[PDB]
Design an enzyme around this catalytic site. Structure first.
Site, PDB file in Angstrom:
ATOM      1  CG  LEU A   1      14.003 -17.671 -46.979  1.00 44.86           C
ATOM      2  CD1 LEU A   1      14.563 -16.552 -47.832  1.00 44.86           C
ATOM      3  CD2 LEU A   1      15.134 -18.547 -46.442  1.00 44.86           C
TER       4      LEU A   1
ATOM      5  CG  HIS B   1      -3.858 -36.050 -23.178  1.00 42.64           C
ATOM      6  ND1 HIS B   1      -3.407 -35.047 -24.006  1.00 42.64           N
ATOM      7  CD2 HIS B   1      -4.945 -36.578 -23.782  1.00 42.64           C
ATOM      8  CE1 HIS B   1      -4.194 -34.963 -25.062  1.00 42.64           C
ATOM      9  NE2 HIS B   1      -5.138 -35.882 -24.952  1.00 42.64           N
TER      10      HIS B   1
ATOM     11  CG  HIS C   1      -7.812 -14.760  -5.193  1.00 41.84           C
ATOM     12  ND1 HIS C   1      -8.945 -13.995  -5.005  1.00 41.84           N
ATOM     13  CD2 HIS C   1      -8.029 -15.480  -6.319  1.00 41.84           C
ATOM     14  CE1 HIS C   1      -9.813 -14.251  -5.968  1.00 41.84           C
ATOM     15  NE2 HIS C   1      -9.284 -15.150  -6.778  1.00 41.84           N
TER      16      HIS C   1
ATOM     17  CG  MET D   1      -9.685 -16.666  -2.625  1.00 39.92           C
ATOM     18  SD  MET D   1      -8.625 -17.994  -3.235  1.00 39.92           S
ATOM     19  CE  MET D   1      -8.577 -19.078  -1.808  1.00 39.92           C
TER      20      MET D   1
ATOM     21  N   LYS E   1     -18.067 -20.455  -5.270  1.00 43.30           N
ATOM     22  CA  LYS E   1     -19.202 -20.179  -6.149  1.00 43.30           C
ATOM     23  C   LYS E   1     -20.468 -20.870  -5.673  1.00 43.30           C
TER      24      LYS E   1
ATOM     25  CE  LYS F   1      -8.808 -14.335 -15.399  1.00 37.31           C
ATOM     26  NZ  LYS F   1      -9.076 -15.728 -15.890  1.00 37.31           N
TER      27      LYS F   1
ATOM     28  CG  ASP G   1     -33.102 -32.155 -33.331  1.00 35.28           C
ATOM     29  OD1 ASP G   1     -32.318 -31.790 -34.232  1.00 35.28           O
ATOM     30  OD2 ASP G   1     -34.339 -32.025 -33.399  1.00 35.28           O
TER      31      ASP G   1
ATOM     32  CD  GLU H   1     -30.992 -31.606 -37.387  1.00 36.39           C
ATOM     33  OE1 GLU H   1     -30.197 -30.820 -37.952  1.00 36.39           O
ATOM     34  OE2 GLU H   1     -32.079 -31.248 -36.887  1.00 36.39           O
TER      35      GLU H   1
ATOM     36  NE  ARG I   1     -41.027 -25.781 -32.677  1.00 32.13           N
ATOM     37  CZ  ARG I   1     -39.774 -26.240 -32.671  1.00 32.13           C
ATOM     38  NH1 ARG I   1     -39.368 -27.076 -33.615  1.00 32.13           N
ATOM     39  NH2 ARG I   1     -38.926 -25.865 -31.718  1.00 32.13           N
TER      40      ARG I   1
ATOM     41  CG  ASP J   1     -36.089 -27.498 -29.315  1.00 34.29           C
ATOM     42  OD1 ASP J   1     -36.574 -27.299 -30.449  1.00 34.29           O
ATOM     43  OD2 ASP J   1     -35.463 -26.607 -28.688  1.00 34.29           O
TER      44      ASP J   1
END
Ligand SMILES: [Cl-]
Ligand code: NA
Ligand code: NA
Ligand code: NA
Ligand code: NA
Ligand code: NA
EC number: 3.1.21.1
Length: 1283
Positions: free
Chosen positions: A50, A761, A798, A804, A807, A858, A906, A991, A1202, A1239
RNA sequence: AAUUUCUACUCUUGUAGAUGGAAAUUAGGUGCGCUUGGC
DNA sequence: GCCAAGCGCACCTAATTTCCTGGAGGACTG
DNA sequence: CAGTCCTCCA
């Protein structure tokens, strides 16, 4: 005096919290039985249908009003010019007020209050506008006043599907008020005309005038472009670029035509496009003749206008038709392949190309448009064929070979199609071989394509890849046939031409098939989205107040630290109060919230007294008082004085501050304010909702200096939450019967196994319902909450017998690199189909594997249907809704704390974000690239993800997102920066972008600092949930933001990277002005001397800043003179022992050693220099233009401080001047007290521009920061400090 | 490799940090195809 | 191969506006 | 007409 912890309770901040809703007991069964979810889904679908139908009304009405507009734009143009010339706050405010007048002038057409129209037209516009933003839209009356259009039966059915439910469009009414508003807002049509499009149009008029004054022939070219496109036939090109015509550029159809005058018009792919003005200017410049250089020196590109709000875009360019289904694409293409097989196109092509081995190639022609394409496809460089033909023709010229004669040859190669034999003679036999190989490849691929069947559908990506592969193959043959020249002027081989033309015509559909298939195959499939739930209640969860629980349907419970949402649907079509009964706190049960709220007193007290219909009516014919008894415990008197006070014949109201400004009558303003405040107190003591509220903490009415200060103290007293125990059985019975839909308000901090810190939260929410907050409100619970249903949208997991892989390795620090991780994960799960790599097997004893004790899936949250709850809250509830003089308050603190440190942030060439922390005198405390945060290289991850998205688009496969990864990275950056800011109590300097990861960072940093809670702080300390820090000014928009937002400052980027940290030196020369021998000679003449220093092996080039002024950037800085040094190219060592060569430059890319090159130059010239004599007069008097050019290039290299080489990791700063202690800065020493690379040097000087602002604030007698930092003021400041 | 949702994780059936929603609009970007040209 | 000016299509991303409401008012019901 | 409940004012 001021205190960092005083930056709290300064202004209200609103946020939304999101939770899952877990149905309890029979709640879900009852919801399914009643069909509420399907009904809410249908209502959302009906809305989506609509909305475009209703928008026809707004679009038609806006377009009809805009066609009548006729304004004089000179005054707006004048105010724009004056602000651009003066750049002061006075001329800025003049322009702002002029823009308001023009926006109002446009708006007056909408609402029917413009002198430029008759009374009858104005009256009808007022009648239309009155019903445009409410339920009157739905009755269809406005249709009669707009045209002869009527609603179709299907449209009436949609309209009736919102009977007794038009408030589903309440937000939409506001979105449309935002379209027609006269306010300074980007959503609105007046703003779009006045502030977006008129400046662009005005600039185009100026561009046109400068161009045709300088090059008058452009006028005829522009007129003919206009005539050729056939638009604006009644308007000369001059009038198109004059202010009065802008009155004809307010509707979309006109805007589209103007932009097509600028941009031209395309027909079908493969045919010549009609040029617009900008292409004509571009082509004229690319001719590279004398006129080209003149045009190029002026603004030479017209600015297209933005679209008009809401309007549909139209184009005169050709639009392809669309495939509509997998079956349309596959069947249509399969038919086409069959035709190509039957037509014998490939055998003919192969026979045509095979003919080229024996026929006369002097009559086979290559298109000059294609020669560079062919050179790239067949040779090693795009210009190989062009250069070869050039060289061959040069060797055929008779007589002396002039520059003009060589230029003639170059011109001919752009204008003439080349016969194939000349190409072969010029390029050699290897060209013929590459030609053969490319032809065989292209034909062979087209062949395999015609033979290979198409997939059954396009559902799998592998099936899309088959389609694309075959299209690529036929498009390749199409491209190949287009290598040959088509012009009738060439002496083409007739049979070869007719045969080639035949199969080309048969190949023409391939291009349309290619684009049509891509346009379809790359569409994103239909996806599952959550949708709003109403349970058939138009005001569900619109508010929480006790008195409206029946009609808003929503209540809150707490039990044993868990939170519940209760929804009470209608019963057999009727609302029925549940009337839960409070009971003793000894009784088992739930604590139910009792929420009391009298909204914004500024609006609600007038609505419930002075603005009553009976009161307004009474005061049209009476001056006597009227007494109100309904909902008042004792009568509230309304006098004519009180009524008039809130209903003046003209604004402003006498008790507002504006009246005291305009009139200057402070005796009257303070009298009216005290009278109105006294009235509100009378009201509040009698209105039944407020009469029990203790207001004695308010000051005597006369003592308030303005109304906003009074309301800011009043409103916190008009909101209260409390709890009462409800017996367990009453709640459970209500859920059992279907009178109560009960949901746990859930996130994982409420999980059984929760034991860590909560989300921020969650802390906001539990803080809201804490005893301290209930006793004195820091956080308010707001109405306009929303419920959603999200159908499942995913099906990788898994499983229990698997393993598992962590890491991080056994040391819990070292991560496994991505390629090794996948390989090792497969290996330990016995799914590796090959040998373990050497490095993976080396890591094997130090990996940590986990037995899958319970399935971990997952996307588990997306694999079932869920309910969700979005609920707004307001933090800092004791404060006013907006702060007063936030920046001055910060600047008062900063003047009392001159040792405040500074965080410079920066964006880098090789670093996403780079930070440098300095103390208040500029000493570097910390410096750090943020490419990597806690061993995760976000810089690499983002770069890889962008390469994946590009490859995906090229392959017609799912692109996906990068925004979620950017936000994840930026949240880590925010965490680090805020921690530094709080630890150091520092200002942060960014900046100023008016001079994407970094801009998004800026907004998230400002937003975080509007309301900063640190989850480890006690709730009652500043920074805890009930006393948030507020360190930035209230955010509204980027466009409306100055250079300061509280503790955040914005500074210009120029001269922050290419600047010597030890001296403030910058390269002062504009090298574009040192072009030729004469200026190069003048440039060297401007130096006092150049001489060798036998003590150090350096050369010293003495420059006084008042010389060579025509070659300078106009920034004298602070030093009268500089000793520029060619550093001896000797070995130095950094802090870690790594060697580097002093004075090295990286120039376009080779290493250059300027001192060594200077020595070699002087020895080549026989110029004596080891005696310390001035070298420059010797070079100048000898006047060797190559030696002089080399000298100037060496000077330019020395001044290039530079030096970067992405391939070696070099990006250093090596200054060309020594500082006051003899030192020539080089970041390659890696001294941690100075910038470690270029930098870091940028972030350092960003911070120091903040220090400049703080220093000038300190030395001023006011609390206002200077606006902007001119380049000269920055250089003089920093050079004075360092020298 | 779990999430209100995002990112990074896995001693811990969950951990660390972040997280203003919804509606509406507009602007820009990436990729592909094409046109006329420049190198 | 890159680039300029421009047109068509696909999808992705971000900025900027509004609201964050109880109760007066009256249309609709039975 | 009296009670209900959607709409939209301030
Ligand atoms: Cl710079
Ligand atoms: Na946690
Ligand atoms: Na939003
Ligand atoms: Na594009
Ligand atoms: Na081209
Ligand atoms: Na292009």
């Amino acid at each position: 005096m001021t205190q960092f912890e005083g930056f709290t309770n300064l202004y209200q901040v609103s946020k939304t919290l999101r939770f899952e809703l877990i149905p309890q007991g029979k709640t879900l069964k009852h919801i399914q039985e009643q069909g509420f979810i399907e009904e809410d889904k249908a209502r959302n679908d009906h809305y989506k249908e609509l909305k475009p139908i209703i928008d026809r009304i707004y679009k038609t009405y806006a377009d009809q009003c805009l066609q009548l507009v006729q304004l004089d734009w000179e005054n707006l143009s004048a105010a724009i010019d004056s602000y651009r010339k003066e750049k002061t706050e006075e001329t800025r405010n003049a322009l702002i007020e002029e823009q308001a007048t023009y926006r109002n002038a446009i708006h007056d057409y909408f609402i029917g209050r413009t002198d430029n129209l008759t009374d009858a037209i104005n009256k009808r516009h007022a009648e239309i506008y009155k019903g445009l933003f409410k339920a009157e839209l739905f009755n269809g009356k406005v249709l009669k006043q707009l045209g002869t259009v009527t609603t179709t039966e299907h449209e009436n059915a949609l309209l009736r599907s919102f009977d007794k439910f038009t408030t589903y469009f309440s937000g939409f009414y506001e979105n449309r008020k935002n379209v027609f508003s006269a306010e300074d807002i980007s959503t609105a049509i007046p703003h779009r005309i006045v502030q977006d499009n008129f400046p662009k149009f005005k600039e185009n008029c100026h561009i046109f005038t400068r161009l045709i004054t300088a090059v008058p022939s452009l006028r005829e070219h522009f007129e003919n472009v206009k005539k050729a496109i056939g638009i604006f036939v009644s308007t000369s090109i001059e009038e198109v670029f004059s202010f009065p015509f802008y009155n004809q550029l307010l509707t979309q159809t006109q805007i589209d035509l103007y932009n097509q005058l600028l941009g031209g018009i395309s027909r079908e792919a493969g045919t010549e496009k009609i040029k617009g003005l900008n292409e004509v200017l571009n082509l004229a410049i690319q001719k590279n003749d004398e006129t080209a250089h003149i045009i190029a020196s002026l603004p030479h590109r017209f600015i297209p206008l933005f679209k008009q709000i809401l309007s549909d875009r139209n184009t005169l360019s050709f639009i392809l038709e669309e495939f509509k289904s997998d079956e349309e694409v596959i069947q249509s293409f399969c038919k086409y392949k069959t035709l190509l097989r039957n037509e014998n196109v490939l055998e003919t092509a192969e026979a045509l190309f095979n003919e080229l081995n024996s026929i006369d190639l002097t009559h086979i022609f290559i298109s000059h448009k294609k020669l560079e394409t062919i050179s790239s496809a067949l040779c090693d460089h795009w210009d190989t064929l062009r250069n070869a033909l050039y060289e061959r023709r040069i060797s055929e010229l008779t007589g002396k070979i002039t520059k003009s004669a060589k230029e003639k040859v170059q011109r001919s190669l752009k204008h003439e199609d080349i016969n194939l034999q000349e190409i072969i003679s010029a390029a050699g036999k290897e060209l013929s071989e590459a030609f053969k190989q490319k032809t065989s490849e292209i034909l062979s691929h087209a062949h395999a394509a015609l033979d290979q069947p198409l997939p059954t559908t396009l559902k799998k990506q592998e099936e899309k890849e088959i389609l694309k592969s075959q299209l690529d193959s036929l498009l390749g043959l199409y491209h190949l046939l287009d290598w040959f020249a088509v012009d009738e002027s060439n002496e083409v081989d007739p049979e070869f031409s007719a045969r080639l033309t035949g199969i080309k015509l048969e190949m023409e559909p391939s291009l349309s098939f290619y684009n049509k298939a891509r346009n379809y195959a790359t569409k994103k499939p239909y996806s599952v989205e959550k949708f709003k739930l109403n349970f058939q209640m138009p005001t569900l969860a619109r508010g929480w107040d006790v008195n409206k629980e029946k009609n808003n349907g929503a209540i809150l419970f707490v039990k044993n630290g868990l939170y519940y949402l209760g929804i009470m649907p209608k019963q057999k079509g009727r609302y029925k109060a549940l009337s839960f009964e409070p009971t003793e706190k000894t009784s088992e049960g739930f604590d139910k919230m009792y929420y009391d709220y009298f909204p914004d007193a500024a609006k609600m007290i007038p609505r419930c007294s002075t603005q009553l219909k009976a009161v307004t009516a009474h005061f049209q014919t009476h001056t006597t008082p009227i007494l109100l008894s309904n909902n008042f415990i004792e009568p509230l008197e309304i006098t004519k004085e009180i009524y008039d006070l809130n209903n003046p014949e003209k604004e402003p109201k006498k008790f507002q501050t504006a009246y005291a400004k305009k009139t200057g009558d402070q005796k009257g303003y303070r009298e009216a304010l005290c009278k109105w405040i006294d009235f509100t107190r009378d009201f509040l003591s009698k209105y039944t909702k407020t009469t029990s509220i203790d207001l004695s903490s308010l000051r005597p009415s006369s003592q308030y200096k303005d109304l906003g200060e009074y309301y800011a103290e009043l409103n916190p007293l008009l909101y209260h939450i409390s709890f009462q125990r409800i017996a367990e059985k009453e709640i459970m019975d209500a859920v059992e019967t279907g009178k109560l839909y009960l949901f746990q308000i859930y996130n994982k901090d409420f999980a059984k196994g929760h034991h860590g810190k909560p989300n921020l939260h969650t802390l906001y929410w539990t803080g809201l319902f804490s005893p301290e907050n209930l006793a004195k409100t820091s956080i308010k619970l707001n109405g306009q909450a929303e419920l959603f249903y999200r159908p499942k949208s995913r099906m990788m997991a898994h499983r229990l017998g698997e393993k598992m892989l962590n890491k991080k390795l056994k040391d819990q620090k070292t991560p496994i690199p991505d390629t090794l991780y996948q390989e090792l994960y497969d290996y330990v799960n016995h799914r590796l189909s090959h040998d373990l790599s050497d490095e993976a097997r080396a890591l094997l004893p130090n990996v940590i594997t986990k037995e899958v004790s319970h399935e971990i899936i997952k996307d588990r949250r997306f694999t079932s249907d869920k309910f969700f709850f979005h609920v707004p809250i307001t933090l800092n509830y004791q404060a006013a809704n907006s702060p007063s003089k936030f920046n001055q308050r910060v600047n008062a603190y900063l003047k009392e704390h001159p040792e405040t440190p500074i965080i410079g942030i920066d964006r880098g060439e090789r670093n996403l974000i780079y930070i440098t922390v300095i103390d208040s005198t500029g000493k570097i405390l910390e410096q750090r690239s943020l490419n990597t945060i806690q061993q995760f290289d976000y810089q690499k991850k983002l770069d890889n993800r962008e390469k994946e998205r590009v490859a995906a688009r090229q392959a017609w496969s799912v692109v996906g997102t990068i925004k979620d990864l950017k936000q994840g990275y930026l949240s880590q950056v925010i965490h680090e920066i805020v921690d530094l800011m709080i630890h150091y109590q520092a200002v942060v300097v960014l900046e100023n972008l008016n001079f994407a990861v970094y801009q998004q960072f800026e907004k998230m940093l400002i937003d975080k600092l509007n309301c900063l809670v640190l989850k480890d702080y006690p709730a009652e300390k500043v920074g805890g949930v009930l006393n948030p820090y507020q360190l930035t000014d209230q955010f509204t928009s980027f466009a409306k933001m100055g250079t300061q937002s509280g503790f955040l400052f914005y500074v210009p980027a120029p001269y922050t990277s290419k600047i010597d940290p030890l001296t403030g030196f910058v390269d002062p020369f504009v090298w574009k002005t040192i072009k030729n021998h004469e200026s190069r000679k003048h440039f060297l003449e401007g130096f006092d001397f150049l001489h060798y220093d036998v003590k150090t092996g350096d050369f010293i080039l003495h420059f006084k800043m008042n010389r060579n002024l025509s070659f300078q950037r106009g920034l004298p800085g602070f030093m009268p003179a500089w000793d520029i040094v060619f550093e001896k190219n000797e070995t130095q060592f950094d802090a870690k022992g790594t060697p580097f060569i002093a004075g090295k430059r990286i120039v376009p890319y080779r290493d250059l050693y300027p001192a060594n090159e200077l020595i070699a130059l002087l020895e080549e010239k026989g110029i004596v220099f080891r005696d310390g004599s001035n070298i420059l007069p010797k070079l100048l008097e000898n006047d060797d233009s190559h030696a002089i050019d080399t000298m100037v290039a060496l000077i330019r290299s020395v001044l290039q401080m530079r030096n970067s080489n992405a391939a070696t990791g070099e990006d250093y700063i090596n200054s060309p001047v020594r500082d006051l202690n003899g030192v020539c800065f080089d970041s390659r020493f890696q001294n941690p007290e100075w910038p470690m690379d270029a930098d870091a040097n940028g972030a350092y000087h960003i911070a120091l521009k903040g220090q400049l602002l703080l220093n000038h604030l300190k030395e001023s007698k006011d609390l206002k920061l200077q606006n902007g930092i001119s380049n000269q003021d920055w250089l003089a400041y920093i050079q004075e400090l360092r020298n």
